[PDB]
Design a protein around this ligand. Structure first.
Ligand SMILES: C[C@@H](Nc1c(Cl)cnc2ccc(-c3cnc(C(C)(C)O)nc3)cc12)c1ccccc1F
Lengths: 146, 142, 153
């Protein structure tokens, strides 16, 4: 019947953005609906409430170097009333333990959070050079109002 | 309540395949969602949260490099056109003791009436068939 | 304003002040309890029967390897009103150190995140715990690294 009025977003990484994790909505199977905006690479919350927040990144390397590789993926919240950047969800992986075959490290982050109107959300990594885009659906960021 | 929903689980008896079931312990199909040809069929257009999880298990590492994939695809109504919505890859063996590798996926998508969704893996021989609350596939109309 | 969700939900985080322990908090920025979920004696209390996604992440960190004898575990358990003893729902074990650090070599910091997640039929009054064996290896300095939650489907 009547379509959903729930604020939602599902944005995907730009495979040809050099040295960055750039989010896009103008792609097949990506979206912004019911007031969610994508501004300065951040998802902007249109109304207060409970939201599921999620992101996936996929890292890939060919063997292990001598300099220690640390991979991080973090979802942050910038609340309009506080004007502060706070981690909501974060993970750190060390793909190489003993040093030198291609390795793969997916990092999926998800949770339920109380958000405020105007909050800004970012999903970031430290190593965009290790991102893999072999297939579609491997690198994404989204929110769903409950 | 009237929202199309599904939560299907893997068959622990289906040899070398990832077979989804709605006739099991904590599974369901409601408000028009169907399970046909191992694919969830969308009864109406709208926003859906689509999710899944698979578990892989191996005893040690072989000489051949093992890559584990899990993918959720969308097959647009009428056409056979298959497109990845969500996908991940894991390499359990680095240097070639039992290991465990979960892969979980989830996101919100605009779907059309009659779209078919599949949740597939490349290695059903590595599937951890144990009837835990952990190999599943589901959708929820928002 | 839109009608609030009536779904029981929780997202609790580790107390970063409680070093050497895994203490869950709802009384912390960006942590919540809603629609009847309680946090009592470090456990999540289920307010109503149904399907729930239960999830948790812990992050372990060490500087080098003391030997290959470090075992890291994370477990989610259920205490049902009908069977008031812990049953494991989800569990994982990790050995961060494979070869042990040779004397004087760079003690490269290792990281081991463990995610536990699944969908379970729960009953009213179920108590859920998310526990680790090594709180001394837990890295909860920065926010968002260590959490435990439930979402009624
Ligand atoms: C985004 C999410 N995705 C999932 C994944 Cl990657 C895996 N399994 C799931 C199982 C069930 C559901 C789910 C979540 N929410 C519902 C509602 C209340 C909208 O009806 N219905 C099913 C979502 C997920 C996620 C992941 C991790 C931590 C919290 C989450 F919300």
């Amino acid at each position: 019947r009547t379509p959903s009025d729930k604020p939602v977003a599902h944005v995907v990484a730009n495979p040809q953005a050099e040295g960055q994790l750039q989010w896009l909505n103008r792609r097949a199977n990506a979206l912004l609906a019911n007031g969610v905006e994508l501004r300065d690479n951040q998802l902007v919350v249109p109304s207060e409430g409970l939201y599921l927040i999620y992101s996936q990144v996929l890292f890939k390397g060919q063997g292990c170097p001598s300099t220690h590789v640390l991979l991080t993926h973090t979802i942050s919240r910038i609340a309009v009333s506080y004007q502060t950047k706070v981690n909501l969800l974060s993970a750190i992986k060390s793909p190489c333990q003993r040093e030198t075959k291609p390795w793969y490290e997916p990092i999926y982050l998800g949770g339920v959070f109380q958000l405020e109107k105007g909050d800004r959300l970012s999903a970031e990594i430290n190593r965009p050079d290790y991102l893999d885009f072999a297939e579609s659906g491997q690198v994404y960021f989204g929110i769903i109002a409950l």
